[PDB]
Amino acid sequence: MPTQSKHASINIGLIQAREALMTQFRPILNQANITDQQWRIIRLLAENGTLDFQDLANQACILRPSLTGILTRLEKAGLVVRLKPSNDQRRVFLKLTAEGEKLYEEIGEEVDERYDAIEEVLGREKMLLLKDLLAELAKIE
Amino acid sequence: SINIGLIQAREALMTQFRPILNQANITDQQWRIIRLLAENGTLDFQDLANQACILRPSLTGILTRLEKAGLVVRLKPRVFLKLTAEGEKLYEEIGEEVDERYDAIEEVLGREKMLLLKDLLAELAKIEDALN
Ligand SMILES: O=C(O)Cc1ccc(O)cc1
């Protein structure tokens, strides 16, 4: 065995943590016919109201051409609508439709159950702390 | 959303470490595997798959290339995996630059916050098992 690095990999910790959430969320998403990437988008559009294409890619962490393809499909499905701003000719905003909002709620409630279970166990204070630290690490640069 | 927060925090780390891994001509997945092997000493294929969060056929491909590069050895003739001498060496020289970038990050957020995050992730993982 070599000498361990000074810092443990926060990266691997982040990856294992999200993957443990996904095994709990995978059957929920499968039944609603929604992928992991699709739900990141759906939950972000619901919670932010709207995001422009560029901000949506950064926050959902999806490569840009792949996001376009996903968006195209979500629009054809009637879940996502494009919003154009009167002060920028190229910039595109995205928002859930009525159908998209309803889908968010019915999936959102199922998903939130595990978040609630963890929160009743870990405590609201710690839960907030974890969310705030992730956001502080994420907003670096 | 802890889910979304987790992936955003990860994407932010990636940007900090990308230049280090690319200069070494190593991918995130390859580095992930090298670290897990280095830090566990020896692992079976399945355990490696689970800890790296990589599906088995995709892992086989990555392992195939790490072996051809002389960094990883399969134990032959359930399959076990181990780093070579060179793989260990690579872990140390890349690992040092990686620790350096972590020191810089820790200076931005603060050591206490970094430790808090590590502690909460560890507590999160132990809640997940308990609930199940
Ligand atoms: O945790 C590490 O080992 C550093 C690292 C972080 C993110 C990434 O994508 C690659 C390496």
Residue numbers in the entry:
A (entry chain A): 1 to 141
B (entry chain B): 9 to 85, 91 to 145
List passages from the publication reporting this PDB structure.
NadR belongs to the MarR (Multiple Antibiotic Resistance Regulator) family, a group of ligand-responsive transcriptional regulators ubiquitous in bacteria and archaea. NadR binds the nadA promoter and represses gene transcription. In the presence of 4-hydroxyphenylacetate (4-HPA), a catabolite present in human saliva both under physiological conditions and during bacterial infection, the binding of NadR to the nadA promoter is attenuated and nadA expression is induced. Each NadR monomer consists of six α-helices and two short β-strands, with helices α1, α5, and α6 forming the dimer interface.
First, we crystallized NadR (a selenomethionine-labelled derivative) in the presence of a 200-fold molar excess of 4-HPA. The NadR/4-HPA structure revealed the ligand-binding site nestled between the dimerization and DNA-binding domains. Unexpectedly, only one monomer of the holo-NadR homodimer contained 4-HPA in the binding pocket, whereas the corresponding pocket of the other monomer was unoccupied by ligand, despite the large excess of 4-HPA used in the crystallization conditions. Inspection of the protein-ligand interaction network revealed no bonds from NadR backbone groups to the ligand, but several key side chain mediated hydrogen (H)-bonds and ionic interactions, most notably between the carboxylate group of 4-HPA and Ser9 of chain A (SerA9), and chain B residues TrpB39, ArgB43 and TyrB115. At the other ‘end’ of the ligand, the 4-hydroxyl group was proximal to AspB36, with which it may establish an H-bond (see bond distances in Table 3). In addition to the H-bonds involving the carboxylate and hydroxyl groups of 4-HPA, binding of the phenyl moiety appeared to be stabilized by several van der Waals’ contacts, particularly those involving the hydrophobic side chain atoms of LeuB21, MetB22, PheB25, LeuB29 and ValB111. Specifically, upon analysis with the CASTp software, the pocket in chain B containing the 4-HPA exhibited a total volume of approximately 370 Å3, while the pocket in chain A was occupied by these three side chains that adopted ‘inward’ positions and thereby divided the space into a few much smaller pockets, each with volume < 50 Å3, evidently rendering chain A unfavorable for ligand binding. Taken together, these observations suggest that Arg43 is a major determinant of ligand binding, and that its ‘inward’ position inhibits the binding of 4-HPA to the empty pocket of holo-NadR. Specifically, in addition to the different inter-helical translational distances, the α4 helices in the holo-NadR homodimer were also reoriented, resulting in movement of α4 out of the major groove, by up to 8Å, and presumably preventing efficient DNA binding in the presence of 4-HPA. Subsequently, upon ligand binding, holo-NadR adopts a structure less suited for DNA-binding and this conformation is selected and stabilized by a network of protein-ligand interactions and concomitant rearrangements at the NadR holo dimer interface.
